[PDB]
Design a binder for these strands. Structure first.
Ligand SMILES: [Mg+2]
Ligand SMILES: [Mg+2]
Ligand SMILES: [Mg+2]
Ligand SMILES: [Mg+2]
Ligand SMILES: [N+]
Ligand SMILES: [N+]
Ligand SMILES: [Zn+2]
Ligand SMILES: [Zn+2]
Lengths: 365, 163, 365, 163
DNA sequence: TACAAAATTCCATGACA
DNA sequence: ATTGTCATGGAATTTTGTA
DNA sequence: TACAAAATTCCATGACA
DNA sequence: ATTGTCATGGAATTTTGTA
C-alpha cells in the first residue's frame, strides 16, 4: 500500500530519494552502497525481525547484521530494539552490562552495644562434637565474642546470647536472613528484651560486612595456629577471641578491647599511657577517642553505573538457579528507593521485597 | 600513686550449695574491685576445676592483674596456682577467718546474696535462667559513692537497660 | 654490654642524644615524647618481636603497635620485618596485596585448523543418558563443534574427535589439564596423527578463554531455548551448534561459518555480497578478511602489579585447600620467566612446574 | 550468471551393502558439487531414517541449497521430502536408470568406490575405523582440473595432511 | 633552613560470605 | 523493610635529628 | 559548508570456567 | 613447558541526506 507510492517516484518520510526503487519477483527492491536489498511491507517487518532474532537470540547489532543481509528499511534498529525489549527469554537470561552505583559506608554506631552484627561460620571439621561458630561483633568497637555450636540454630543462638547479654543488652542486632535469625522464636527472644532485629537484604553479605570481615580474621588466625597440627579448633576459640580483641587496627590505632573499655587488661604488651589519669579522666579521653575515629567515604561511581529510580523496571537475580535455567527473575517495578543502594520492588507476584541493587539489573530496552 | 582501675583486682568467691537448677549447685562470683562490675558463673562444685573452667571464660575477655579470694581449698590448690602463673595473674589471699576485701566489694557481695535469696525463694530451682537478669540488675545499680553504675564505670556510657 | 655506655652519656649510632637514658628496676629506660619506654638489650629484641607477633600473627604496624607499648629501640620496624619474613605460618596463610601484571592477548591463529581449543561442559541434567558436552573451537575462526558425552573421558574424546578430524586435522589442540586430555591414551591418539598437544598452566581457565568463552554462549542459548520446557538439551545441540556458527560477532562483522568457508550456507538470512565473484575471487577476498581482523591489545597495568623475575621467591596457590588450612604453598624460586605471565618454578620439592602468575604471589619481606 | 559455489548442490548416494563393520552396512556418500568435498556416513540401512539421522549431522554444519540423488526409495519418500522442505533444501532427482551428476562428481564417486574396495579387501570388516582416513585422502587429492584439492576450495588454505 | 633516613600514612588488593 | 569491611605491605609522604 | 538524526563504533561489564 | 575472551546495550563518535 505505502510501498506503491515509491516506485512511482513520489517521496515518503524515511525513504531517501537518490536511490532508485524498483520491482523484481513481486518484491520491492532498492539499490544501496552496500548492495541491492529488499524493502518489505511494514506489516512484514515485525515478523522478519523476529525470525532474525530467534535464530540465536542475538542482541542489537548481531540481529541487525543478519537482517541487513537481505533487507533494508527506514530505522531498522528502532524495530530491532522493539523485539529485544519483548523477548521474555533474552530478558531473563542475559547478563547485565551496567554496574551498581558506589557502595555506601554506613556510619559507625555511636557507642558500644548500640548494634551487634552476628553470623555463623561453618561447617568446620568436627571438633569435640561442634561444627559451627556463632560470631558476634559490636559495631562500634569491633569487640567480638565467639561461641561454638553443633548447628546454626535458633536454640543455639538463644543459649549463646543469653550468656552474652548477661553482660550488656544491645539496642539492635543485625543479621543476614539465615534460618536461625528469621525464626519467630528468635523474634520473641528479642522482643522479650527490647532488642530490635534488623536484617540484611536477601543474599547480600556485604550488608553484614562488619561480621563477615571478622570471620576472615578468625579463620585466618585459626589456620595459622593449626599449621602442622590436626584441626582441633574448639580449644582455640577462647585464645583467638582474646587475641583478636586485643589486636591493633593499623588505621584506628586502637584495639577493640581499648575501644570497649578505654584501658587494657592484664595481657601481653599492655598499653600504660593512662596510668596517671583517674578512671574519670580516662573515661572522657575515651569518649573523645570514640567520636574521632576514622570514617571511610564512598568511592567514585564507575564509568557505567546505574541508580534506581521509582517506577523503573528492574529484575531480581535468581538465588539458587538450577542448571541451564535463567539467572534472572521476570521484570518488576521499583516501588520505593530507600537509599541509592537499597530498594523495594513489587515482585513475583506481587509481594514487596526489600532488595539490594547488587541483586538487581535494570531491564534493558 | 596509680589511681584504682578496672582489671586491677577481681574478687572471687563461691555462693552455695543452692537447690539444684539445671543440675548446677554453686555460683562463682567475680567482682571487679574498682568498678563493682560482677560476673556470675554457675558451677557443679566449689572445686579448682570448676573455677578454672569458669575463669577461662572470663579471662578470654579480660585478665585481672590480681585475683583476691579467701583460703578456700579451690583457690589455694597448686593447680589453681599454676593456672594463674600461666596467665601472669598474681594471687592474693585474705587471712583465714578474717576475710577482708574493699568496702565497696563487701556491699556488693552483700547485695548479691540478698538479691539471690529474694528470687531464690518462690522459685528456688529456676535460678539458673535468672543469672543473666540478676547480673544486669547488679551492674546497672547506682553506687551511692560515685553515683555511677558499674556498667558506666566499665564501658563509659549509659546502658540500654537502666534500673 | 652496649647498653652500659649509654647511661654514662656517651653516644651510640642509632640512639639519639637529647633524650635522657636512665636505670630503674634493673632495666634501662628512656624518656620519649610518646612516654617512658624500656630499651631491651639487643640479645632480647628478637624474642620480644616474636612474642608480640605471636599473639595474633599480626603484620608490620599491628605488631609494632604492641611492642611500642612497652619498648623502644633504634629501627624497630627493621627488626619487626625480619620476623614477618621468617614466619612460616604468616607466609603460607596471608593473602597477597599485589595484582598480577596485565593479561596477554595471544595472537589469533593465522588460519583455520592451526589450533583447536577443547573443553567439556557439565555435568548437565541427564538427557537421553548424556551428561557432558565436548566443545571444540577453532582458534582462528571461532567455528565450534559440539559432541554430547556420558562422561568427560578419553574414550569419549577420541570417539568424538575421530568424527571431527575425519574432515580436517589440526596442527595443535589446546586443552586444560583435565584427566581426559592428560591421559597417555590421548597423547598416543595425537601422536598417531601429527597433532601437537598444548596444555594450559594448571587451574587457570583464562588460558582456555576461547573455549570457556564459547561455553557461556552455548549455555546461554540452551537456557533460552529451554525456558518453560523440561531440560531436553540433547536434541538441541545440533541446532545450537548451527545457530552459533552462523552468529555475527559485532566486533568482527563476521560469523565463524563465514570465516571458515568465505560464503554462507543455505541458512536463514544468508549473505549474498559475493554472488558474482568466482570461487577464486571470493577465496582471496577471504584470505584478506582473515588477516585484517581486529586484534585486542593488552590493558594498562594496575597501580600495584608485580611481574616475575628469575630468582625471585614466589608461592603457588593451594588448589583444593581443606577447611582451615593455608591457601598458599611454601616459597619456591622462579627458574625461568617464559613470558611476563607464565613462569617455571622449582616447587615442592623439587620438580619443575609451569605456572600462571595469577596462581602466584610474591613472598613478602 | 552466478558462478558455481560450495553448498550449491550436494550429491548423495548409497554405497552398500558392505561386510558388517561395527554392525554397519552402508555408506551414505555426500559430495559437494562445486568443490568435490566428500562426507561419508556409515548407516545400518539405505533408508529414509538412516539418511535423515546422517544428514542431520551434516546439515548442522552447512545446509546445501540443493540435494541431488537418484530415485532410490529412501530419497523419494515423503518423509525425506518433508525433511528437506523444513530446512528449505530443494530436492532434485536424476531420471531413473539415467543417473546424471556433473563430470567432476562422477570422477569423484568413482575414486571412492575404488578407494573403498582397495582397502575393503585384506581388511573387509575393519572399514568403519578407516572412514576418517578415507575421507581425508579424497579431500586432499589434486583435481587435474583446477589443481586445487577439495580441501583448498572449501577452506581456502593448504591442509596439514597433504597427499 | 636544609638534608637523608626513619617513621608514619596512604591505599589497592583480596577475602569474609 | 535498609546500608560493605579492613589487615596487609610496598610506595608516598611527613617527621625527625642534626646542622 | 552546516545542520539533526541515524548509523556505526566504542567499550565497561560480567560470565565461561 | 606457555598466553583470556567476547556478546551486550547505552553513550560517543562519525556518517548521511539534504541544504
Ligand atoms: Mg550467614
Ligand atoms: Mg567461699
Ligand atoms: Mg575443563
Ligand atoms: Mg543408490
Ligand atoms: N547511616
Ligand atoms: N602469541
Ligand atoms: Zn531473545
Ligand atoms: Zn606469623
Amino acid at each position: 500500500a505505502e510501498l506503491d507510492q515509491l516506485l512511482q517516484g513520489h517521496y515518503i518520510k524515511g525513504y531517501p530519494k537518490q536511490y532508485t526503487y524498483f520491482l523484481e519477483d513481486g518484491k520491492v527492491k532498492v539499490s544501496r552502497p552496500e548492495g541491492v536489498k529488499i524493502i518489505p511491507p511494514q506489516s512484514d517487518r515485525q515478523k522478519i525481525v523476529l525470525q532474525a532474532h530467534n535464530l540465536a537470540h542475538t542482541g542489537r547489532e548481531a540481529t541487525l547484521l543478519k537482517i541487513a543481509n537481505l533487507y533494508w528499511w527506514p530505522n531498522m534498529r528502532k524495530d530491532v530494539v522493539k523485539q529485544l525489549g519483548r523477548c521474555q527469554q533474552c530478558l531473563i537470561t542475559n547478563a547485565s552490562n551496567k554496574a551498581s552505583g558506589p557502595i555506601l559506608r554506613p556510619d559507625r554506631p555511636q557507642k558500644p552495644f548500640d548494634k551487634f552484627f552476628i553470623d555463623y561460620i561453618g561447617p568446620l571439621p568436627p571438633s569435640q562434637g561442634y561444627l559451627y561458630v556463632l560470631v558476634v561483633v559490636d559495631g562500634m568497637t569491633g569487640f567480638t565474642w565467639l561461641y561454638p555450636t553443633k548447628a546454626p540454630s535458633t536454640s543455639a543462638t538463644v543459649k549463646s546470647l543469653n550468656v552474652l547479654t548477661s553482660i550488656a543488652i544491645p539496642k539492635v542486632i543485625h543479621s543476614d536472613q539465615g534460618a536461625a535469625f528469621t525464626s519467630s522464636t528468635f523474634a520473641e527472644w528479642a522482643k522479650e528484651r527490647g532488642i530490635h532485629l534488623e536484617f540484611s537484604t536477601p543474599y547480600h553479605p556485604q550488608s553484614s560486612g562488619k561480621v563477615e570481615r571478622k570471620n576472615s580474621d578468625i579463620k585466618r588466625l585459626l589456620t595459622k595456629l593449626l599449621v602442622g597440627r590436626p584441626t582441633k579448633w574448639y580449644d582455640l576459640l577462647p585464645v583467638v577471641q582474646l587475641a583478636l580483641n586485643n589486636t591493633y587496627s593499623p588505621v584506628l590505632k586502637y584495639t577493640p578491647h581499648q575501644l570497649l573499655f578505654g584501658i587494657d587488661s592484664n595481657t601481653p604488651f599492655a598499653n600504660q599511657d593512662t596510668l596517671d589519669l583517674t578512671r574519670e579522666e580516662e573515661l572522657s579521653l575515651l569518649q573523645e577517642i570514640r567520636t574521632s575515629l576514622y570514617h571511610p567515604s564512598t568511592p567514585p561511581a564507575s564509568s557505567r553505573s546505574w541508580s534506581p529510580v521509582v517506577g523503573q523496571l528492574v529484575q531480581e537475580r535468581v538465588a539458587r538457579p538450577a542448571s541451564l535455567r535463567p539467572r534472572w527473575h521476570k521484570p518488576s517495578t521499583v516501588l520505593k528507593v530507600l537509599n541509592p543502594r537499597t530498594v523495594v520492588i513489587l515482585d513475583h507476584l506481587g509481594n514487596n521485597r526489600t532488595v539490594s541493587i547488587d541483586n538487581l539489573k535494570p531491564t534493558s530496552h | 600513686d596509680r589511681p584504682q582501675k578496672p582489671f586491677d583486682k577481681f574478687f572471687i568467691d563461691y555462693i552455695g550449695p543452692l537447690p539444684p537448677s539445671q543440675g548446677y549447685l554453686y555460683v562463682l562470683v567475680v567482682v571487679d574491685g574498682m568498678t563493682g562490675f560482677t560476673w556470675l558463673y554457675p558451677t557443679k562444685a566449689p572445686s579448682t576445676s570448676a573455677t578454672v573452667k569458669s575463669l577461662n571464660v572470663l579471662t578470654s575477655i579480660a585478665i585481672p592483674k590480681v585475683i583476691h579470694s579467701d583460703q578456700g581449698a579451690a583457690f589455694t590448690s597448686s593447680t589453681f596456682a599454676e593456672w594463674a602463673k600461666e596467665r601472669g595473674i598474681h594471687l592474693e589471699f585474705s587471712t583465714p577467718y578474717h576475710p577482708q576485701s574493699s568496702g565497696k566489694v563487701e556491699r556488693k557481695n552483700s547485695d548479691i546474696k540478698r538479691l539471690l535469696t529474694k528470687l531464690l525463694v518462690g522459685r528456688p530451682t529456676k535460678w539458673y535462667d535468672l543469672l543473666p537478669v540478676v547480673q544486669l540488675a547488679l551492674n546497672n545499680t547506682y553506687s551511692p559513692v560515685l553515683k555511677y553504675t558499674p556498667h558506666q564505670l566499665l564501658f563509659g556510657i549509659d546502658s540500654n537497660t537502666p534500673f
